RNA sequence: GAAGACAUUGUCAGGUGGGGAGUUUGGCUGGGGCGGCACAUCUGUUAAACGAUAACGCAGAUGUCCUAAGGGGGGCUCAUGGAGAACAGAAAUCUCCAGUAGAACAAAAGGGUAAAAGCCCCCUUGAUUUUGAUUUUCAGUGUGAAUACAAACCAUGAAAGUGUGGCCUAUCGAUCCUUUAGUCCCUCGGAAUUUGAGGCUAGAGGUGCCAGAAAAGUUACCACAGGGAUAACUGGCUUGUGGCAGUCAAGCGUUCAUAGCGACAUUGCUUUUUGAUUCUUCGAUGUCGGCUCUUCCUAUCAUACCGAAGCAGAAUUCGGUAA
RNA sequence: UUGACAUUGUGAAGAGACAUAGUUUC
RNA sequence: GUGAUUUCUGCCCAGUGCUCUGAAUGUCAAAGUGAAGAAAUUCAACCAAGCGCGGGUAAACGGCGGGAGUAACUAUGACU
RNA sequence: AGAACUGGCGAUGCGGGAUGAACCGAACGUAGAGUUAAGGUGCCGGAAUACACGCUCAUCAGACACCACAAAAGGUGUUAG
RNA sequence: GUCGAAUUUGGGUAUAGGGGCGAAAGACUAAUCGAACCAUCUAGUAGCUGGUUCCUGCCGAAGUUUCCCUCAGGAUAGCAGAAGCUCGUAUCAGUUUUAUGAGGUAAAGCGAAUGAUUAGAGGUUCCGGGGUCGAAAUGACCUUGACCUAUUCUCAAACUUU
RNA sequence: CACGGACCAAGGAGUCUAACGUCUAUGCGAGUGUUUGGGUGUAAAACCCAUACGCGUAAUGAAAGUGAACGUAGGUUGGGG
């Protein structure tokens, strides 16, 4: 529920709001993917060049 | 509306107390100052916590403002204000209004 | 409303490490004057499972 | 709360007043205390008076100028001309302001 | 050993900060909400021939526009029509006749106006200065608007005159604070000069919820004080709508208004339709349907006895006494 | 989080001024 | 966040967020600087992060059109 | 549901309208006698089963303002025109 | 339902109220949970609800005006009481009469203005359209329109002389 | 067919205070107010009192400031006595 969590309650279950969190969020926003610079399924090759 | 630039009517001037010619302007404003009594006491009332102080307007519903002229007798100097009705277009500019004639082109 | 999960864990009550089985913490030597003018040597006499 | 016409009033009573009310119940008895100690000061202070040789002195400001009125004790140039130290005066009964 | 006058820490400053705090989130209303504004106003009507007068009554209008569309003076006469003149036609520009306003005067409407209040021209800034009285609204407060004078200075006209904005009836704004104009005037309290600041008089910056707070949502997790001044359910008035029944008889029915029907009209009844109302109940009168069981009504589906038929018989339809 | 000031000292090269001596500042 | 396995997991970075070896003469605090003033003060320049500009990002939040015609009956519409 | 003028009810009993806030009559100290209002007088029920001229017969008669409803349309019932 | 494990369970121990704890129900945190319990601030505020204690005598209302984040509340005026005070035939009046004004409702009117509305009759065109004669006509003849004249039936809250 | 009230005792709600408006009674009157205090006492009483102070006797200006007789302290009209 809300009370509990950034991401809690909706009639459906959803975020409601972008997941990538900022660093300079404070305690008790920082949920989800914190500093994210990118986001989504990795494609191709990964390795440090 | 329009009006003249200039324009002869009465100035209280002791020395004047006639009617003279006076150079037509519209008033503005006139900066600030901190150091008003006004400004002062705002700003100390601001000072460490508790927010706004002081109640900020918001529910305007005017959308035009009376205007000023500044009326200056070229003789005895001094000014007199004079205020016009509500109006949306002023000019003090020229153009009279002419005669009776067609629509350009 | 309420503290969430993630910053109640900092205050380490229900959340410490269990800790009760551990062989004790992985460590290198002392770096001594045995070990970085010469060698010193040992010999390993258990290898053996940590909690 | 407001009506009539009527004068308007200042009633400073939105504290805790009542926790501060002091009527002075004990007039009569401070009064005879107060006799008590002169009785008892006097007797003790042997023949001497209950109170100092004070100066005239003229009123501070223009409203009371007018008036001379008791003064705190004499300054130390006018017991000087009285003949004596003020050291001396103080213990025959008189004050001495050295202000 | 690493690190090094950098980190760190201390104080101010800018950014960020529903993680958290505190708060707020108009009114009228045939419930409330959505809408509209009856919330500040104007014209005509409702309005019942003085004045006043209500509804979310009726038909409209207002937050502007004008250096002339203000002020003065002279001259002129308008809408429309008829009869006339090359190109010229329904409509171009010319002339004469008729012409009470049938036009025009920013705008809503209503009043008003003809040597004008309209149209053309001429000269202008009285749309100015001071501060009182008065009428409407009214509390006989304010504001808005307006009226007639006093005291100036002007304009126009030969002049009497007229002119204190717009022919009249609408077109708008407190206290605090800011800003400007005014007199060169008062104060800064130990005494002066100079900046600065503060007063006095008159304006501008605005509150349209218009006598004038600074203000987003959600709650079906919900709470309190109340309300039958107020909705949802029975019940009451109503009966538009729904349902049922008539009168007239043009038509339908091969022929033939009325066997059976029945247009245009028109009179009713009903209260198992739905509306309309908001009288009772919000310190509670347990929703929808079904089950069970009683009783009642009749606008009768069957059953008894009848009358009618476009009733041969059989079948059916219409009607009566009948629950 | 970002800046300034204080904690804050010592050399050296290079810039910066009285306008190409060294007190000063980056 | 999604929810065993199997299989698949498309297009969209304009928006809101997140994020970057980016650019820079736009905005921009306190201190410090300069200028005027008898001073209080006023004005100006410089100027941190941020913002604005540029780039990345959807297994981030989320999104993934409307009208008009067109085939030898009609219908439908691959096509425009 | 909403206005105008008056009169009421609310705040008010009493007599009448059976009953009823508002209608009719009439406004109130405690009582005696008389006379009335509005409304009544077969019996309930105080008070003429009074007088007088007509009309009306209903196998769902009718019966007194407010008021507790009935219409168009019909009758060779009967009445007077 | 499950019953050999993400099993059941004792004691000890830790976590405390905008806090804990939560395989997540706003669940659980000692019959208390969308913020526990205890005391105090605290007799919290209440335009709202309830109640408000003897008798008789006299007088006796309002639900309307204006302003208000006003609409279950106030302020203002009115209506009411009390106290009287200055006077006294005096001056007074929810009335009439007489004289002199104002008014545009009811009625009325529409062969009177504006606006509606039924019917004909008679006129008028170099000029609205058709059609016959036509080479056409600013020609003639019918035709239907409008307009005009004198008539006719009917109407008005935002029409009107009266 | 709105709410409280089964019954009975006892308790149970416009108070006190600061500062006020009108009215009234009383003292004194251009004044008035003894009670902070002092004196004194038969001791919280009653009796007595000096200096101040408060309100009043002056107003009006934002202020600096100025500051109430032309006159029988006026004329006119009504006025009890
Ligand atoms: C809107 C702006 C300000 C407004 C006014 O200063 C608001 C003030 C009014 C007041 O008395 N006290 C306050 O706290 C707010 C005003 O007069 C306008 C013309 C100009
Ligand atoms: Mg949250
Ligand atoms: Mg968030
Ligand atoms: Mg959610
Ligand atoms: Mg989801
Ligand atoms: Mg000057
Ligand atoms: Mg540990
Ligand atoms: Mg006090
Ligand atoms: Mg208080
Ligand atoms: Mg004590
Ligand atoms: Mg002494
Ligand atoms: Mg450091
Ligand atoms: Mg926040
Ligand atoms: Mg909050
Ligand atoms: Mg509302
Ligand atoms: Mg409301
Ligand atoms: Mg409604
Ligand atoms: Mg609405
Ligand atoms: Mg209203
Ligand atoms: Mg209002
Ligand atoms: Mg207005
Ligand atoms: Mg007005
Ligand atoms: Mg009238
Ligand atoms: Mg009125
Ligand atoms: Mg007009
Ligand atoms: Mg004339
Ligand atoms: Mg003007
Ligand atoms: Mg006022
Ligand atoms: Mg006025
Ligand atoms: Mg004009
Ligand atoms: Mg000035
Ligand atoms: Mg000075
Ligand atoms: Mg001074
Ligand atoms: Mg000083
Ligand atoms: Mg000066
Ligand atoms: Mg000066
Ligand atoms: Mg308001
Ligand atoms: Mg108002
Ligand atoms: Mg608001
Ligand atoms: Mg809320
Ligand atoms: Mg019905
Ligand atoms: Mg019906
Ligand atoms: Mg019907
Ligand atoms: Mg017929
Ligand atoms: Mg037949
Ligand atoms: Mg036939
Ligand atoms: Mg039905
Ligand atoms: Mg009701
Ligand atoms: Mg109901
Ligand atoms: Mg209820
Ligand atoms: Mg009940
Ligand atoms: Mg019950
Ligand atoms: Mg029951
Ligand atoms: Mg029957
Ligand atoms: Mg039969
Ligand atoms: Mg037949
Ligand atoms: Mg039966
Ligand atoms: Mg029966
Ligand atoms: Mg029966
Ligand atoms: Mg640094
Ligand atoms: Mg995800
Ligand atoms: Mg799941
Ligand atoms: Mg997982
Ligand atoms: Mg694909
Ligand atoms: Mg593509
Ligand atoms: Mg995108
Ligand atoms: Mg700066
Ligand atoms: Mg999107
Ligand atoms: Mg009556
Ligand atoms: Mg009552
Ligand atoms: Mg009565
Ligand atoms: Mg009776
Ligand atoms: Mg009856
Ligand atoms: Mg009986
Ligand atoms: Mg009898
Ligand atoms: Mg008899
Ligand atoms: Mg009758
Ligand atoms: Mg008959
Ligand atoms: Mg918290
Ligand atoms: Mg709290
Ligand atoms: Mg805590
Ligand atoms: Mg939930
Ligand atoms: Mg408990
Ligand atoms: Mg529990
Ligand atoms: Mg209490
Ligand atoms: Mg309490
Ligand atoms: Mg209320
Ligand atoms: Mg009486
Ligand atoms: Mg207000
Ligand atoms: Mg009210
Ligand atoms: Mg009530
Ligand atoms: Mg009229
Ligand atoms: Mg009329
Ligand atoms: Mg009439
Ligand atoms: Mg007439
Ligand atoms: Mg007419
Ligand atoms: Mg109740
Ligand atoms: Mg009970
Ligand atoms: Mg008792
Ligand atoms: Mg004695
Ligand atoms: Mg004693
Ligand atoms: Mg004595
Ligand atoms: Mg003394
Ligand atoms: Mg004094
Ligand atoms: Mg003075
Ligand atoms: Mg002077
Ligand atoms: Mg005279």
């Given at each position: 529920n809300p009370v509990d969590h950034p991401h809690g309650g909706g009639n459906h279950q959803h975020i409601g709001k972008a997941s990538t969190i900022s660093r300079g969020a404070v305690s008790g926003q920082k949920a989800g993917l914190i500093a994210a610079r990118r986001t989504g399924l990795l494609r191709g090759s990964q390795k440090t060049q | 509306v329009n009006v003249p630039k200039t324009r002869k009517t009465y100035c209280k001037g002791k020395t004047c107390?006639?009617?003279?010619?006076?150079?037509?302007?519209?008033?503005?404003?006139?900066?600030?100052?901190?150091?008003?009594?006004?400004?002062?006491?705002?700003?100390?009332?601001?000072?460490?916590?508790?927010?706004?102080?002081?109640?900020?307007?918001?529910?305007?519903?005017?959308?035009?403002?009376?205007?000023?002229?500044?009326?200056?007798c070229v003789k005895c100097k001094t000014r007199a204000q004079?205020?016009?009705?509500?109006?949306?277009?002023?000019?003090?500019?020229?153009?009279?209004?002419?005669?009776?004639?067609?629509?350009?082109? | 409303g309420r503290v969430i999960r993630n910053q109640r864990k900092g205050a380490g009550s229900?959340?410490?490490s269990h800790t009760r089985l551990r062989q004790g913490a992985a460590k290198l030597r002392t770096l001594d004057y045995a070990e970085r003018h010469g060698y010193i040597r040992g010999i390993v006499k258990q290898i053996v499972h940590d909690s | 709360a407001i009506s009539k016409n009527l004068?308007?009033?200042?009633?400073?009573?939105?504290?805790?007043?009542?926790?501060?009310?002091?009527?002075?119940?004990?007039?009569?008895?401070?009064?005879?205390?107060?006799?008590?100690?002169?009785?008892?000061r006097a007797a003790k202070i042997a023949p001497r008076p209950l109170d100092l040789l004070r100066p005239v002195v003229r009123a501070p400001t223009v409203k009371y100028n007018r008036k001379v009125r008791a003064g705190r004790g004499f300054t130390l140039a006018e017991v000087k001309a009285a003949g004596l130290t003020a050291a001396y005066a103080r213990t025959i009964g008189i004050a001495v302001d050295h202000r």
């Amino acid at each position: 529920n809300p009370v509990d969590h950034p991401h809690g309650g909706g009639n459906h279950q959803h975020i409601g709001k972008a997941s990538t969190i900022s660093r300079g969020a404070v305690s008790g926003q920082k949920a989800g993917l914190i500093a994210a610079r990118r986001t989504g399924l990795l494609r191709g090759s990964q390795k440090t060049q | 509306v329009n009006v003249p630039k200039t324009r002869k009517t009465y100035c209280k001037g002791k020395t004047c107390r006639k009617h003279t010619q006076h150079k037509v302007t519209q008033y503005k404003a006139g900066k600030a100052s901190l150091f008003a009594q006004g400004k002062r006491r705002y700003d100390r009332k601001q000072s460490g916590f508790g927010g706004q102080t002081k109640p900020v307007f918001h529910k305007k519903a005017k959308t035009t403002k009376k205007v000023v002229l500044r009326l200056e007798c070229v003789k005895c100097k001094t000014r007199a204000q004079l205020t016009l009705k509500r109006c949306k277009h002023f000019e003090l500019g020229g153009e009279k209004k002419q005669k009776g004639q067609a629509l350009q082109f | 409303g309420r503290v969430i999960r993630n910053q109640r864990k900092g205050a380490g009550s229900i959340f410490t490490s269990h800790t009760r089985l551990r062989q004790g913490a992985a460590k290198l030597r002392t770096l001594d004057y045995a070990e970085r003018h010469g060698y010193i040597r040992g010999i390993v006499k258990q290898i053996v499972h940590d909690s | 709360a407001i009506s009539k016409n009527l004068p308007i009033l200042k009633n400073h009573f939105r504290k805790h007043w009542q926790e501060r009310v002091k009527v002075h119940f004990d007039q009569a008895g401070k009064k005879v205390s107060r006799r008590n100690a002169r009785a008892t000061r006097a007797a003790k202070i042997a023949p001497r008076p209950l109170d100092l040789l004070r100066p005239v002195v003229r009123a501070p400001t223009v409203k009371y100028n007018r008036k001379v009125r008791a003064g705190r004790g004499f300054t130390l140039a006018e017991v000087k001309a009285a003949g004596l130290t003020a050291a001396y005066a103080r213990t025959i009964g008189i004050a001495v302001d050295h202000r």
